[PDB]
Amino acid sequence: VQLVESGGGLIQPGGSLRLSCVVSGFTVSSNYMSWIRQAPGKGLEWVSVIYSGGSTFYADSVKGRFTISRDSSQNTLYLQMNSLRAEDTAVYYCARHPYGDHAWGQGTLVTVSSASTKGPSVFPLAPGTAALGCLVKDYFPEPVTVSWNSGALTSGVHTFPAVLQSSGLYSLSSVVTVPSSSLGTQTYICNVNHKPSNTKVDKKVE
Amino acid sequence: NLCPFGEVFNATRFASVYAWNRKRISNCVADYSVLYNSASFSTFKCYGVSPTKLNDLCFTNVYADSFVIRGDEVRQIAPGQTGKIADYNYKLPDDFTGCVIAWNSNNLDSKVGGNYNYLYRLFRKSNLKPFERDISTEIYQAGSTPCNGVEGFNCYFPLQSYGFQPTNGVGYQPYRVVVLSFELLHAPATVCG
Amino acid sequence: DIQMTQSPSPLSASVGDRVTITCQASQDIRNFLNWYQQKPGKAPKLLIHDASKLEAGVPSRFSGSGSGTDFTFTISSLQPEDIATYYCQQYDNLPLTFGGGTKVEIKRTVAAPSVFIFPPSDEQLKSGTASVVCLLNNFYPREAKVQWKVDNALQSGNSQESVTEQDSKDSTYSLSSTLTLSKADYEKHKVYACEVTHQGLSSPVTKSFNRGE
């Protein structure tokens, strides 16, 4: 069974998004399904449920604004989110939740902010054991994904959690510990990707 | 002759909500105010009429439906409600002329070791129509593969058991419910006061 | 609403010991309690359903007890990969409600941090800003002090930190401290130092660079 959420991203307060959840492995119109969201750093909150026979129920924080729905043709669950508020910023999960066999999707991040998308600027963190890395600074909508040597380097890598700066822009660093004997004999490139700005940046560290 | 309201209210056994009982009351006289003054009913809320006024009205047929549900599901035995009981077990019409009576039955219907004999429909593809009675025990089909009578993945037994214990919270304690339905048919009115 | 109250906030144990998380319900919820495990960065995973019934593929060390309002969740022998945030959730009464969460952490022998300092890049200095970064690598326990010093002037208010999640294998943490300065102030001083204090270190360790050398 697979559940795949989509439709999430940045949106200004007061706007509307429609999330989608495509199901493989059961009939969305015959099953109990719920929307559960998780704000960044906080816990889980139940938002909406649709019953096997169509009756719908909502959390109090989302009434009059959120609507849950289904299409039997495409085997897809929908969440129409109107009049969005910053408190609705969360990763949203679909699930065959309350009754019936358990299933959870991987989530879709919704950010509700008046701030603007900004792509990261990537600067090197230049080097027995040695350490090097990349500083990924001044990006907003989040997430940023960092890989090293296009996936070749995975051992010794620590991509730190992002911090929120006073500007309202995020910043993170990714570091990697390598044998120092290899600093002249090996190329280290950090691959930074920020799909909300469609930015990909590769950066060599020397 | 007085109406057999004792056989429906003081009955030693009640039905499960999915297979609710119906008593068709005919050719008798009924004091609805004697019912109301039992001081043991936790819910006795009539829609579209009054108990006193019922004593003056005449009807062709009166129906007494009865079943057992959880305490927190009595709010669903009302017009315009949704939920597992209202949607898949006992549905009242939005245009309901009748009474809804319920009382706590924890001393009668709960047992040590759990009383697991009272059931309710958990899965159904479509809401019941008003006054429908789905006794189907066929396996519920949650996916594309046929079930072939075997409970398994994507194949569910449609009924679940209430677990009535003595010390459940009142919302999880059994309540006996009687719904009185009043009926003008284009026929002789034979139930009066 | 039914409000779920969990074992406060962080809970730690050594590898192989027991961990007991308690969940309290505002009112009777029978056995209709779910327990989820959420590892860092991933989706919640249902471990126990119906208070005690262990989902398929779930290791034997996980177990669930309780009925009515008080429930417990137990790991009989904690493994380094069981680092996660565990949630209880009542599912049979509406406003479906979760516990606040209980983070579970490995206790581990002391491990001193490896310290590295990174001077600003010339690509950043074009913009007019200078970021000095300090790294503390693979240390336990989490508590560590980073003190930025610019010409032995203790610096406050111009730095942010970030700690990784405990590693699933060595049960360590890593920390990143970033000192952000304007290019004007950055050129007003020579020695930029990162002084680190940690239980695994007998004395504080300082790593320094002199600007433009």
Residue A76 sits in the same domain as residue A148: no
In this complex, the residue of A25, A53, A55 whose CB is nearest that of residue B125 is A53
> What experimental approach yielded this model?
X-ray
Chain C's closest residue to A58, CA to CA, is: C95
Residue A99 sits in the same domain as residue A131: no
Q: Which residues contact C107 (CB under 8 A, 6 or more apart)?
A: C12, C13, C14, C15
**Please, are residues B66 and B177 in contact by the beta-carbon 8 Å criterion?**
yes
Listed residue (C80, C48, C46, C81) closest to C65, CA to CA: C48
Residue A149 sits in the same domain as residue A69: no
The CATH number of residue B165's host domain is 3.30.70.1840
**Per-residue 3-state assignment (H helix, E strand, C coil) for chain A:** CEEEEECCCEECCCCCEEEEEEEECCCHHHCCEEEEEECCCCCEEEEEEECCCCCEEECHHHCCCEEEEEECCCCEEEEEECCCCHHHCEEEEEECCCCCCCCECCCEEEEECCCCCCCCEEEEECCCEEEEEEEEEEECCCCCEEEEHHHCECCCEEECCCEECCCCCEEEEEEEEEEHHHCCCCCEEEEEEECCCCEEEEEEEC
Residue A68 sits in the same domain as residue A126: no
Q: Say if B138 falls within a structural domain.
A: no
Listed residue (B165, B16, B8) closest to B88, CA to CA: B16
Q: Say if B136 falls within a structural domain.
A: no
Residue A199 sits in the same domain as residue A139: yes
In this complex, the residue of B163, B167, B169 whose CB is nearest that of residue C27 is B169
Q: Which residues of chain A have a Cβ shorter than 8 Å from any chain B Cβ? A: 25-27, 29-31, 51-55, 57, 99-101
Residue A106 sits in the same domain as residue A197: no
Q: Say if B82 falls within a structural domain.
A: yes
Residue A8 sits in the same domain as residue A108: yes
Range of the domain at A84: 2-112
Q: DSSP class of residue B23?
A: E
Last residue of a domain, one of A64, A92, A112: A112
- The residue written with tokens 């309540």 in the block is B175
B148 backbone φψ class: left, alpha, beta (φ>0; ψ -120 to 50): left
Residue A68 sits in the same domain as residue A127: no
Q: Say if B92 falls within a structural domain.
A: yes
As given in the structure block, the two tokens for residue A40 are 């960044």
Q: Say if B151 falls within a structural domain.
A: no
- Which CA distances in Å does B90 have to A53, B8, B93, B175, C149? 14, 17, 10, 14, 74
Range of the domain at B70: 5-129+161-192
The CATH number of residue A179's host domain is 2.60.40.10
User: Which segments within chain C are labelled E, that is strand?
Assistant: 4-6, 10-14, 19-25, 33-38, 45-49, 53-54, 62-67, 70-75, 84-90, 97-98, 102-107, 114-118, 129-139, 145-150, 153-154, 159-163, 173-182, 191-197, 205-210
For residue C180, which residues of chain A lie inside 8 Å, CB to CB? Answer: 165
Residue A106 sits in the same domain as residue A6: yes
Residue A107 sits in the same domain as residue A136: no
- Domains of chain A: total: 2
Listed residue (C92, B140, C96, B149) closest to A27, CA to CA: B140
Q: Say if B49 falls within a structural domain.
A: yes
Q: Which subunits sit against B, judged by 3+ Cβ pairs under 8 A?
A: A, C
As given in the structure block, the two tokens for residue A26 are 């059961």
- Domains of chain B: total: 1
Q: Say if B44 falls within a structural domain.
A: yes
- Which CA distances in Å does B8 have to B14, B132, B180, C87? 9, 19, 11, 46
Rounded Cα distance, A138 and A118, in Å: 7
Q: Round the CA-based radius of gyration of chain B to a whole number and report it.
A: 18
Q: Round the CA-based radius of gyration of chain A to a whole number and report it.
A: 21
Last residue of a domain, one of A51, A85, A112: A112
Residue A66 sits in the same domain as residue A7: yes
Residue A104 sits in the same domain as residue A157: no
| Ordered structural domains, chain C, with CATH | 4-107 (2.60.40.10), 114-210 (2.60.40.10)
Q: Which subunits sit against A, judged by 3+ Cβ pairs under 8 A?
A: B, C
Rounded Cα distance, C157 and C146, in Å: 13
CB contact under 8 A, A44 and C36: yes
Last residue of a domain, one of A112, A144, A178: A112
Q: Say if B156 falls within a structural domain.
A: no
